[PDB]
Design a protein around this ligand. Structure first.
Ligand SMILES: NC(=O)c1ccc[n+]([C@@H]2O[C@H](COP(=O)([O-])OP(=O)(O)OC[C@H]3O[C@@H](n4cnc5c(N)ncnc54)[C@H](OP(=O)(O)O)[C@@H]3O)[C@@H](O)[C@H]2O)c1
Ligand SMILES: NC(=O)c1ccc[n+]([C@@H]2O[C@H](COP(=O)([O-])OP(=O)(O)OC[C@H]3O[C@@H](n4cnc5c(N)ncnc54)[C@H](OP(=O)(O)O)[C@@H]3O)[C@@H](O)[C@H]2O)c1
Ligand SMILES: C[C@H](N[C@@H](CCN[C@H](Cc1c[nH]cn1)C(=O)O)C(=O)O)C(=O)O
Ligand SMILES: C[C@H](N[C@@H](CCN[C@H](Cc1c[nH]cn1)C(=O)O)C(=O)O)C(=O)O
Lengths: 428, 428
């Protein structure tokens, strides 16, 4: 009956409301004031109101709203003490190791379940291997992705969040097939009316995330990298066609390639492959039936390389607008394409930060590169994504010697995580 | 020293100014008051001012401007009498036969040169065969296209025209290789600083028109045909992607197919094939080097079918905007794509007209279908374009029994033209 929620962002608050209303756990949450003015605003705000709040936008999601109070908000990870049966990781996947290793020996020995909300590929292996020094039979659970979109509308009230969308389908894998925990999640899922698919293992669920395959080619190329680190003369956009954005036959080739390096790795683990196009079309944003042939979507994996690229290119062109939106009187639809790049930025202590795109993709990609080596698999497109990103960081360093920079710029991070995957893989 | 110019549109007026300033011909022109309120406005306007005028927009085209007076404006074709050495066809290609057959026996016997300004594929054969009953050694000349863009700014002054663009390259073929006429055109071409390419025959020049390959798939499909004959709830556009316009993997397949049916026919006549993509890109509107690989443009004809379609699709997507135009401060370029469909319309005597797209493409396509049969070549995509167009006409007839309709709606036109090609082809 004790639960530790690592995160104080909108994901963590949404999940905390779910555990509050539909579980028997006493819930403690943990951010970082030792480290983050964002966490400190949240802590200060919760301290004042003594309540979090989830609101909703679409009323089909009633189950998820509610005002609530938790048992204990910890200010910083090191402050955590005592025993916790279940731990929920509602932070970024590149902090899972860093954050667990700060918990006490006493705390780590008590843990039976670690649930990973937004894992990358390989996150369960890292977390299973690290937890193995403390429990003997740790249960680790992976979702494909967070269940929807939650955000803070007002930065000044970060304890008040708004869930706007919910995903059509999530996946879920456990180190312990059909555990009590697994069945409790499933039951919970249908309370919330969220289609959930249970799959053989955590790895399997972690590969059912489109962003794995799409974010790296989209953000780790010279066009995107310039827009983020250097800036451009006129605004450019993530989803537009060159020169308005990065998308190009080249970019699409790099995506097919990285997709296949990935399906090589998953054949090794005997995990089914992903029909990337079907995923995209039947689970993210839909296109008109006239745009793509149902038989090409369905057989995507057996079709020729050039044809796969064609189909992908076409997918992106189809979503320049929202083809199901309400066109205005001139035949013009909503410019769904016009998503700006987030650029490098100085936090309130004047330190240069790299935004989540592509920071977190560096992490994801670095991990898949390291899995790759250990397994005897090639990854030249991955290697290329990383080279490009490492070069832009260095270039930023050379170009901005007078500015304070974050550890995100440094080489080569994730040693602990790499070691942990190394170790895990030796064993099986 | 007598020249007959058939046409009183802006093409004819531009060409008449050229002959006036740079030839030794007495120039007569001929329209149709028996038939056209457009021709009658022009005749009335010329009658009043006793002068035509070409103005220019870009000053790189000086040579082409000028005010001028011709020897005789005929009101109608049948009014033509006397002898003419040279005849210039500045009318639509589907009227060449109809209009020549109205001239007197005396006139037709005098003619030595017929110059065809905007021929379709097969136009020279039609005109050579028909002229063979009158001259014995008629010279027929074909250009790829008219030399640029001329228009009337003000409908009320249709004797005043504006040439806005000039083509990068035209082609030119004669039944009489390297004739005096051929050399006089070439000399004239460089006076005007218009790159001209001389090719082996008229047929050869007639296939160096992108519209031959592009207009039929773009306009003779259900989406386009609906927009023209029926209308749509919101405006749609010729060059946009579905659902904003017709362009679709399907449409692109139909274009590759019709392109190849065409290259089958041209192999028979031992005429070189057209690299459709190179034509498009290096001679019409240019795209950024990052959009297409130079090696793919260059080797286009030997590349796989699916890849050819990909490349074409990409070409069209690249020209949604003008990628060389001056983007505004939000990163947005000129919406070069937003060309409306011209719809069926009632002339001033309440008769329903079908616009040039796709009227003239019906003609072009009907001719290539007829060449096809006679030569023992397949054309199922052509047949399909025509079937579709014939069906929409009929549907229009069934749906608008209370409205006066033009002969453009009727089946099956061009018998004379077909017979003439039949005859020509038997002989060689
Ligand atoms: N709707 C969504 O926002 C959404 C949707 C899909 C997936 N996700 C993913 O789920 C995770 C949490 O989402 P969120 O919206 O709650 O984001 P967030 O507010 O940035 O939450 C991350 C939480 O972990 C902390 N943290 C620890 N180490 C961190 C590091 N290295 N970088 C950044 N934060 C770190 C953050 O502290 P501070 O608050 O002090 O920064 C915060 O409390 C993220 O990976 C996110 O990409 C979110
Ligand atoms: N810049 C351009 O406009 C341009 C560019 C490239 C190619 N072209 C082509 O060159 C030809 C002439 O161009 P234009 O701009 O001078 O067009 P236009 O004004 O419509 O000229 C066609 C001339 O021929 C007459 N005509 C005879 N039979 C006709 C028929 N069945 N349908 C339509 N007109 C007929 C027209 O009479 P009325 O004047 O009484 O209609 C007119 O005098 C057209 O085929 C056009 O597509 C034009
Ligand atoms: C913003 C960041 N990542 C999103 C992905 C957001 N990507 C979509 C993808 C997309 C493709 N076409 C239009 N939108 C977007 O840019 O809004 C997520 O994990 O759900 C996050 O975790 O909050
Ligand atoms: C309008 C008609 N046909 C044109 C073709 C015009 N087609 C272009 C082609 C195009 C492709 N992308 C943008 N424009 C257009 O629609 O303006 C010609 O023969 O030069 C004419 O003869 O005057």
């Amino acid at each position: 009956s004790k639960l530790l929620m690592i995160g104080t962002g909108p994901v963590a608050i949404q999940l905390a409301n779910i555990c509050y209303l539909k579980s028997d756990y006493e819930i403690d949450m943990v951010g970082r004031a030792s480290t983050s003015e964002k966490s400190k605003r949240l802590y200060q705000a919760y301290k004042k109101e003594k309540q979090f709040e989830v609101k909703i936008q679409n009323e089909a999601h009633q189950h998820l709203e509610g005002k609530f109070e938790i048992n204990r908000l910890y200010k910083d990870v090191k402050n955590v003490k005592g025993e916790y049966e279940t731990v929920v990781m509602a932070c970024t996947a590149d902090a899972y190791y860093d954050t667990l290793q700060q918990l006490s020996l006493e705390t780590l020995q008590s843990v039976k379940h670690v649930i990973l909300i937004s894992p990358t590929f390989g996150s369960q292996m890292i977390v299973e291997q690290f937890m193995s020094k403390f429990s003997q039979d740790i249960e680790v659970i992976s979702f494909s992705t967070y269940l929807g979109d939650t955000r803070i509308v007002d930065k000044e009230a970060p304890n008040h969040v708004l869930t706007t969308g919910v995903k059509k389908k999530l996946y879920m894998g456990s180190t312990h097939s059909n555990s009590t925990m697994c069945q409790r999640i499933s039951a919970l899922a249908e309370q919330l009316k969220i289609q959930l698919e249970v799959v053989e293992s955590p790895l399997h669920a972690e590969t059912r995330n489109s962003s794995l395959y799409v974010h790296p080619p989209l953000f780790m190329n010279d066009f995107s990298l310039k827009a983020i680190f250097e800036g451009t003369d006129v605004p450019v956009y993530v989803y537009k066609l060159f020169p308005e954005g990065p998308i190009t036959m080249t970019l699409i080739r790099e995506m097919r390639l990285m997709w296949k390096e990935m399906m090589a790795i998953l054949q090794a683990f005997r995990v089914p492959s992903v029909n990337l196009l079907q995923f995209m079309v039947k689970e993210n944003y839909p296109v008109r039936p006239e745009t793509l042939d149902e038989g090409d979507i369905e057989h995507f994996e057996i079709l020729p390389d050039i044809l796969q690229e064609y189909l992908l290119y076409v997918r992106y062109t189809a979503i320049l607008i929202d083809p199901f939106s309400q066109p205005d009187e001139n035949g013009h639809y909503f410019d769904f394409s016009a998503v700006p790049f987030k650029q490098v930025y100085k936090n309130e202590q004047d330190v240069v930060q790299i935004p989540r795109m592509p920071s977190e993709d560096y992490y994801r990609t670095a991990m898949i590169q390291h899995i790759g080596k250990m397994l005897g698999i090639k990854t030249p497109m991955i290697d290329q994504f990383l080279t490009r990103y490492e070069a832009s960081c260095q270039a930023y360093k050379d170009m901005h010697q007078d500015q304070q920079l974050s550890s995100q710029f440094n080489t080569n991070l994730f040693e602990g995580d790499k070691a942990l995957v190394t170790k895990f893989l030796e064993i099986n």
